[PDB]
Each structure stands twice: as structure tokens, then as C-alpha cells.
Amino acid sequence: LEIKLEEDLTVIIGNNGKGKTSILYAIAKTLSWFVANILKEGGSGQRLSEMTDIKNDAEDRYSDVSSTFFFGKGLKSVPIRLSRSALGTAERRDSEVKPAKDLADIWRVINEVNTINLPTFALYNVERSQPFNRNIKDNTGRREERFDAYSQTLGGA
DNA sequence: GGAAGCGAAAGTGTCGCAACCCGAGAGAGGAACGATCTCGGGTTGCGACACTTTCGCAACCCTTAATACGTTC
RNA sequence: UAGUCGGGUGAUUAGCCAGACUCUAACUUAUUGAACGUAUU
């Protein structure tokens, strides 16, 4: 499947069990690498599940999620591919996440040398709408500091 | 293909809390014996969370290259 | 309207001017090797 995401707003519609949540999940997994390498040099983002994400029928028992990002005329393409092979497969497929690491390295290094505006990556899935608020004191890393905005940003809730 | 570090993802154990049970005990009433509410352990079920295991990113570039100037794979 | 093509001007990778295109839809890449162009030859 291929999609042509719009620059400002894209709406995905369909019946139940058509793959809209799957598309959002794949995009969030792709953005996790950008978030991780912004927070942490050479950081590891999320990866495709080897138990559920690969198509049940399949022909090669592996799945790929290719994404291309635009960052102006100076960087017209940032290709990142997430790949995973199914359980019990001799040949394992690797992911091509280097350009995302390079772009996030640019962001992080420039920001530390001189403060810049950082991009926002958020996922609001069905795990939202959970009851209650402020369940625990949540000793988690000083919400005041700037890089706390990337904590659990693509978790769904 | 995959050091060395490290973190994601998934599975499993554990451990504390709640909920209840059960015997002991001082003693309400009203004229005695012991109702009834509480104290102190003890057991079980459960779920959040810690702990455990596996995978995968991607150093280096091996003895072993050539060195007019440009695109392309 | 975008976006794209690129003829001109421009101390010139920028800015501007004229013109044109639109399958749902480019993202310019890699050497010393191979071939191509060019220069010595």
C-alpha cells in the first residue's frame, strides 16, 4: 500500500478493520526514531512487532514500512524504513533508519549549541480517554525541563 | 556481517494490598450468662510492577585501492 | 492557485522578468572500478 499524505491535513476513512489504525501505528513507529535520536544520540526507537504486524498469509514472512519526509528544498527526502521478520525465520530483515538519525542529530546538535525550535511528534490513539487524572506523584523527570515534552509523546494516550 | 552500549518488546514471577474469616475477649442487658463489637493473626486472590530473555542498531573494513577533470551506477 | 520546466537579466548557486506544462504521482545519487565526455597524448 502507498499513501500520499497531505502537507496540512490528511483524513483516512473506511469501514472497521480496514487499516487506518494500522497506518497511524506505522507512522508513530516511524516518528519514534526521530524522537529518540532528538532526545538521545544514536537512540533506538520503536520497532515492528514480529508476532502480529507481519501479514498472516505473507509470502516472505517479513514486513516493511517505508516513509519519506520533507524538510525544505535543502532536504527534499528523508527515507526511513522499518523492517521486521516473523518468528522462526532464518533470514532477518534490517531497518534503514540512518537518515532519521542524521536529521535528528542536526536538530539536537544545533539546539545544544544555540537554542532552536524543535518539532512536535504526538500520537493520540484509542488508549486516550482513560479515567482519572494525576494518578500518582509520577517521579519521572522534572516536567519543567524542556525535553520532558518528548516523554511518552507517541504512546497513544 | 555485526564490537559494545543500550533500549524496545514480550513473557513471567512476586509481593503488597484488600477482602474476608475465625478464635479471644471485655462485658450489655438486667439480674444471670454472655450480646456484640473489636483485636490479633491467618489465608487467598489479584494486579501492578519488577525482573528476565531475546532482538536489533551498525564500530571497523580485514594484507589485498588509485590518485588529469567532470557527470552515472 | 500551487508545483514543475527554463529562455533572459543578475560581481551570479540568491534575487527578479518573459514564456510554458499538469498520468492521484522525482526525491539529483557513486570511486580509484566500468563505460561516457574532455584534456594531455
Ligand SMILES: Nc1ncnc2c1ncn2[C@@H]1O[C@H](COP(=O)(O)OP(=O)(O)O)[C@@H](O)[C@H]1O
Ligand atoms: N497481521 C495481520 N495479518 C492480517 N490481517 C491482520 C493482521 N493484523 C490485523 N489484521 C486485520 O486488519 C485489520 C486491522 O484493523 P485496524 O488497523 O485497527 O483498522 P481500523 O482502525 O480501520 O478498524 C483488522 O480487520 C484485522 O483483522
